[PDB]
Design a protein around this ligand. Structure first.
Ligand SMILES: [Mg+2]
Ligand SMILES: [Mg+2]
Ligand SMILES: [Mg+2]
Lengths: 171, 171, 171
């Protein structure tokens, strides 16, 4: 793993966090408790602040960055799939970002919302809490069911465990 | 090059296989002879079985993973383009996956099929063998001319050559 | 950072160029003065020549490659966003390729053109200089305003400086 400062700012990573290999984190970045950053993921906090909560999982090959004056916020329990681009996005508690998705500047993903795989959420777009949105540009296609919420809950719990397991293996 | 075991399962890589730098391979994964896994690709076998045939090429920055109970099967001679996401997908012999595509769960890609760049094959979708499928979601547009099929044999064979060449350089 | 020669040709990189960690560059590749190749980017020059001008920035997780007899050309001042796939593209002076885009074989991006995020420019497609192209397939929708051009100027100016800043930390 690579850690780099930027103009006097360095990442603040919880001790329980898992930082996979070939990951790069730089600048003004805060990573919460039990959160896991998977393989080859890049997080450059050299434009605006980046705050990632607890028990969050940033899956493999993702890119997190920002545009001027637009902080990147990822609250507790969030799941972000493989190869996702988060650019100054605001991702509220428990949301899930489908793999291969691009979440643009100031777009706000509602609490518990689910973004389908391969979607593009345009600048400033707000996705209502607990809904399913997908497409390019992403549109809400329906609100979530209790079965969807159960699986989202299962996914983030699973990843907390996998992160701890891989963290151990890193010996 | 990073190899990790996962819960009792450890990657089994053929001797003639080329595993590029910054590649990560974990758990229940099996890689065949003469296949090449290119730069930054991530293959996490921690959800379900992953089997990769012989003479296969998985190009740069790809992500291979699985959903529960859905193995990831990639038969012989398959060409996986740059930065592709394969999730519990079943790719039949000699098929070609265009760069930037996303093949989702239980989606089966028929033998000799050609998935156009930037495509997204939805969960459970079956793609007829010997056909060309494009779009998001991918739709079959036509059949492959003998010329197409020969360009695929040319690519497939070419990557076995490059695979062994870079493998030599590595050493 | 990995630097590999290919079939007797080794990458020629200006001394002022910044090459981030986990970057892989091989073969027939020329990188100009002060350009910055960001984290996890892959530049494989093993099929056709690749020439990258000066003060260019290739952002994190991008992949540059070619098709037979189709050189990959990127002139001075070009900005290519995160996770971009450039395959035998001809990118003219000062153009900007939005993050998550796929620019295909023989496609040419006119001087100062701006490709919107997540776009796909099909093979052979030509984008007029100083225009905004969006979508998949991408389509020209309008012309760039005066401060759109001003912003583009600001962008490549910061990356030239940011690359030099990170370059120093690297040492
Ligand atoms: Mg950026
Ligand atoms: Mg997965
Ligand atoms: Mg290629």
């Amino acid at each position: 793993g690579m850690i780099y400062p930027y103009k006097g700012k360095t990442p603040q990573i919880a001790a329980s966090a898992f930082i996979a290999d070939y990951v790069t984190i730089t600048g003004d970045v805060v990573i919460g408790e039990e959160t896991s950053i998977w393989f080859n993921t890049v997080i450059r906090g050299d434009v605006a602040p980046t705050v990632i909560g607890n028990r969050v999982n940033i899956q493999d090959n993702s890119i997190l960055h920002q545009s001027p004056n637009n902080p990147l916020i990822i609250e507790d329990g969030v799941t972000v799939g493989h190869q996702v681009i988060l650019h100054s996005a605001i991702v509220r508690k428990n949301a899930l970002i489908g793999m291969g998705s691009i979440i643009l500047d100031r777009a706000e993903i509602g609490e518990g919302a689910f973004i389908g795989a391969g979607s593009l959420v345009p600048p400033g777009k707000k996705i209502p809490p607990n809904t399913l949105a997908l497409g390019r540009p992403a549109k809400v296609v329906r609100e979530l069911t209790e079965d969807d919420i159960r699986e989202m809950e299962r996914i983030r719990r699973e990843y907390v465990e996998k992160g701890q397991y891989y963290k151990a293996l890193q010996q």
